[PDB]
Amino acid sequence: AFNNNPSSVGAYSSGTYRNLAQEMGKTNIQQKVNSTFDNMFGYNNTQQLYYPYTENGVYKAHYIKAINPDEGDDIRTEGQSWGMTAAVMLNKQEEFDNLWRFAKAYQKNPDNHPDAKKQGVYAWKLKLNQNGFVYKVDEGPAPAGEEYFAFALLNASARWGNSGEFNYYNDAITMLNTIKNKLMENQIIRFSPYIDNLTDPSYHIPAFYDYFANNVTNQADKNYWRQVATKSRTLLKNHFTKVSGSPHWNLPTFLSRLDGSPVIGYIFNGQANPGQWYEFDAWRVIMNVGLDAHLMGAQAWHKSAVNKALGFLSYAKTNNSKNCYEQVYSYGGAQNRGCAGEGQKAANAVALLASTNAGQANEFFNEFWSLSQPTGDYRYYNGSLYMLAMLHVSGNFKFYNNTF
């Protein structure tokens, strides 16, 4: 029985986590969740994304391989912090520290970096030189990584304690301070440290902030993060209000102004796509809403947000000869980028945690649950979200609080 009226109390306060998959009637879920991790983390160059990093043949750490069939493989912070996240969620501590060692060592920018805006942040692109070593391809942050880096670490601490190799809890504070100091603007997460009145809706994870707050001890910082959470929901609320119907047709967008306006067209050099596109990043907004609705409780905006989004994708599936919804949508029109992949389907599966239309829910869930785990060239992004979505639909994405 899908629970078509999600609690306005969150899983976080109540300690009651939903098991979407279970509700949807499914079976052997934990197996899937586990096999999912196991494959993603097993040496098989198939679903695998977890790769060991050796230097002169002395093992160092592990990293998540952002597998690139076009531009050629690189190493991004996002997928790394995701790795750490899944690890801690599945009590895989061996793997966790492997990835965190890598991150702390190779992704991190020295705090004596000439550029202050780059200091202690995490280089978003790293690559493997033909010689065999890691180096920074791009020294600018992907603030979402640091976001999850912090979240992953707070949990790691709470789960395993900080007497091991890594003092997760301190590592976590540093990160949190970094985000405050290098990745914010009026408490709204930057799309970059260099542009202003700019955010990426897909970075907002209101519940994470609330969580951060409960895991910082001093009364000043509790407020900071509680504020950031308030503003973040507000942001998504507004953003979602703004995308309602014409001209946007209820799909969130790549970039946003802090008021929640979709950034129309190009506004800076390098910008892959126009800001008003529902694309690879925007894929995650309703996924984040679900997560939020689940953990922090479902308000109406949540419900409307996921529903209408999902609705359009549903409605669009009929508007198509190839009988699917597409990867990119501008002003409600198909940008012809092929049919939705596993990661996009995975995203929408989580979104159902705020959904209320049970019919819809079955449409979207059975579509994700039927997929086989991402393999091949485009498997980095899809597999990463597949893994996250696996924890989400299985009652395995939990907030683990530290006690003081």
Quote the Cα angle for 272-309-322, to 5°: 75
How many whole angstroms separate alpha carbon 127 and alpha carbon 132? 10
Counting every residue, how long is the chain?
A: 404
How many whole angstroms separate alpha carbon 145 and alpha carbon 77? 5
Distance of CA 176 to the CA centre of its chain: 17
Way it was determined: X-ray
- Tell me which DSSP letter residue 337 carries: -
Tokens of 153: 């670490």
Distances (CA, A) of 100 to 128, 155, 223, 333: 18, 13, 28, 41
Q: Name 329's bridge partners.
A: 278, 334
Answer yes or no: are the C-beta atoms of 294 and 18 closer than 8 Å.
Answer: yes
Distance of CA 379 to the CA centre of its chain: 16
Q: What is the CATH number of the domain that holds 1?
A: 1.50.10.10
Q: Domain total for the chain?
A: 1
How many whole angstroms separate alpha carbon 227 and alpha carbon 187? 8
How many whole angstroms separate alpha carbon 337 and alpha carbon 321? 14
Instruction: Return the CA Rg of the chain.
Output: 20
Which secondary structure element, helix H or strand E, spans residue 39, and what is its range? helix 29-41
Query: Which alpha helices (DSSP H) does 189-299 contain, by range?
Result: 206-215, 219-243, 285-295
Answer yes or no: are the C-beta atoms of 267 and 329 closer than 8 Å.
Answer: no
Distances (CA, A) of 197 to 88, 260, 335: 34, 10, 27
Answer yes or no: are the C-beta atoms of 281 and 328 closer than 8 Å.
Answer: no
DSSP characters over 348-400: HHHHTTT---HHHHHHHHHHHHTSPP--SSTHHHHHHHHHHHHHHTTT-----
Parent domain of 295: 1-404
72: left (phi over 0), alpha (psi -120 to 50) or beta: left
How many whole angstroms separate alpha carbon 257 and alpha carbon 199? 6
Answer yes or no: are the C-beta atoms of 312 and 331 closer than 8 Å.
Answer: no
338: left (phi over 0), alpha (psi -120 to 50) or beta: left
How many whole angstroms separate alpha carbon 254 and alpha carbon 236? 13
How many whole angstroms separate alpha carbon 150 and alpha carbon 155? 9
DSSP characters over 111-174: TT-SSGGGTT-B-SEEEE-TTS-EEEEE-S--HHHHHHHHHHHHHHHHHH-SSSSS-HHHHHHH
Distances (CA, A) of 258 to 201, 210, 368: 10, 19, 32
Q: Which of 74, 77, 142, 64 is nearest to 107 (CA)?
A: 77
